[PDB]
């Protein structure tokens, strides 16, 4: 008879787990990311095929590439469940899972005989979701990473506070973000209302009239909104560039284009939120909109400070090689002018 504890997961399920935890699996969008942030990668005994098959957009897998070599626990990806026989064979002490319901968690736990803990990123429209922080704390307790959990959450909270502080009292310019991935890549018409990097900087997002979350808009409305600054999420950059080449007159009529105020940002939404990348993007956008309040911030160095803290490796360079990196975009050539704002 070994010592156990009872843990209340993000669905309010009480789960009994031995206190001695050494072997884990993390499945569903962003579950493995949180384990990476908690420095518990060496406990991971199986991995979704997704990590190797879809290699881009995720700092954690660039920081911990050895995870790709572990035995399969299933395909992964959105809407997939782990392979139960793989779980039974690997016998982790606990399975962490995201984006499932109680029925599903119960079924996996009962069929495998392995404790299942549901984690949650909660609302993706904020840097301070309490379910996300709770998830980090809870996995921290279960994994013996409690101090590290507090540190991760505090880092995120302080970054939010710092961005608010730096932006306090400045006039808010009009802005737009396009190119946002949403079940596939999209171009200029794919945006977001209540976009967290904008919201923390109180930027006047021209689509915020639409409410919150992902939006597809009529790009003719851009001609009326005429945002002072345009940010292109680099998951959609190729599509935007192709659109530009086909519709040069449309784009050249926008004041953002006229003034060279079109910039590339790194994608952060791949397999739910890459929190480091989202924060790095907010520092880059802040420097662009409010340069006097960011004179001490080199956005590329800051991205690597973030990644080094959360993931222990300076992966910005690899991200910039995948997507382009931070800088003004020259729409005719498709080049990113790195080190510009
Ligand atoms: Cl990240
Ligand atoms: Ni008990």
Domains in the chain with CATH codes: 1-144 (3.40.50.1980), 145-341 (3.40.50.1980)
Q: Which of 146, 206, 122 lies closest to 172 in space, CA to CA?
A: 206
The CA distance from 263 to 245, in Å, is 17
Say whether 179 sits in a helix, a strand or coil.
coil
Q: How many CB atoms lie within 10 A of CB 4?
A: 12
What gap in Å lies between CA 228 and CA 244, rounded to an integer? 18
Q: Say what angle helices 299-311 and 146-167 make with each other, to 10 degrees.
A: 160
Ligand positioned closest to the Cα atom of 279: 1
What distance in angstroms lies between residue 6's CA and the mean position of ligand 2's atoms? 6
Instruction: Compute, in angstroms, the gap from residue 278 CA to the centroid of ligand 1.
Output: 7
Resolution (A): 1.7
Using N-to-C axis directions, what is the helix angle for 316-323 and 299-311, rounded to 10°?
120
**Solving technique:** X-ray
Ligand number, closest to the Cα atom of 37: 1
Instruction: Give CA–CA dist 176/206, Å, rounded.
Output: 6
Report CA(330)–ligand 1 centroid distance (Å).
Answer: 27
How far is Cα 276 from Cα 307, in angstroms, rounded to an integer? 6
Closest ligand (CA of 310)? 1
C-alpha distances (whole Å) from 204 to each of 172, 174, 196 are 6, 5, 12
25 HSE (CA, 13 A, CB side) = 33
Q: How far is the CA of 276 from the centre of ligand 1 (A)?
A: 4
Cα separation, 267 vs 128, in Å, equals 19
For helices 130-143 and 146-167, what crossing angle results, to 10°?
150
The number of residues making up the chain comes to 341
Å from CA of 5 to ligand 2 middle: 6
Give me the residues paired with residue 337 across strands: 328
- Are residues 92 and 117 in contact, defined by beta-carbon separation less than 8 angstroms? no
Please answer whether residues 328 and 260 qualify as being in contact, where contact means their C-beta atoms are separated by less than 8 angstroms: yes
**88 CA to middle of ligand 2, Å?**
24
Please give the Cα distance from 200 to 156 (Å, whole number).
12
The bound ligand whose nearest atom lies closest to the alpha carbon of 15 is 2
């Amino acid at each position: 008879i070994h010592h156990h504890h009872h843990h209340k997961d993000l669905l309010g399920r009480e789960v009994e787990i031995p206190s001695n935890v050494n072997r884990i699996v993390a499945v569903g969008p962003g579950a493995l990311r949180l384990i990476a942030y908690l420095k518990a990668t060496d406990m991971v005994v199986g991995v979704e095929d997704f990590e190797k098959l879809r290699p881009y957009g995720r700092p954690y897998i660039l920081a911990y590439p050895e995870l790709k070599k572990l035995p399969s626990v299933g395909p992964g990806g959105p809407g997939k469940l782990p392979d139960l026989e793989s779980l039974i064979t690997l016998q982790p002490d606990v399975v962490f899972i995201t984006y499932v319901d109680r029925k599903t968690a119960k079924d996996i736990q009962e069929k495998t005989g392995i404790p299942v803990v549901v984690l949650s990123y909660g609302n993706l429209g904020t840097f301070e979701d309490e379910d996300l922080f709770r998830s980090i704390e809870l996995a921290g307790k279960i994994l013996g990473r409690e101090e590290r959990a507090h540190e991760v959450v505090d880092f995120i909270r302080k970054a939010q506070e710092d961005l608010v502080t730096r932006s306090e009292g400045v006039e808010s310019p009009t802005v737009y973000v396009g190119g946002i991935g949403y079940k596939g890549a999209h171009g200029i018409d794919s945006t977001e209302a209540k976009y967290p990097p904008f919201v923390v900087l109180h930027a006047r997002n021209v689509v915020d009239e639409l409410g919150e979350g992902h939006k597809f808009i009529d790009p003719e409305k851009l001609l009326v909104w005429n945002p002072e600054y345009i940010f292109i999420d680099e998951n959609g950059l190729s599509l935007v560039l192709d659109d530009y080449s086909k519709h040069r007159e449309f784009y050249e009529s926008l004041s953002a284009v006229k003034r060279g105020k079109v910039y590339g940002i790194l994608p952060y939404n791949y397999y739910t939120t890459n929190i480091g990348t989202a924060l790095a993007d907010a520092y880059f956008i802040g420097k662009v909109l409010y340069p006097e309040r960011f004179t001490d911030i080199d956005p590329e160095e800051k991205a690597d400070e973030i990644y080094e803290f959360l993931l222990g490796k300076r992966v910005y360079g690899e991200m910039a090689e995948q997507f382009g990196g931070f800088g003004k975009i020259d729409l005719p050539s498709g080049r990113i002018l790195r080190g510009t704002w």
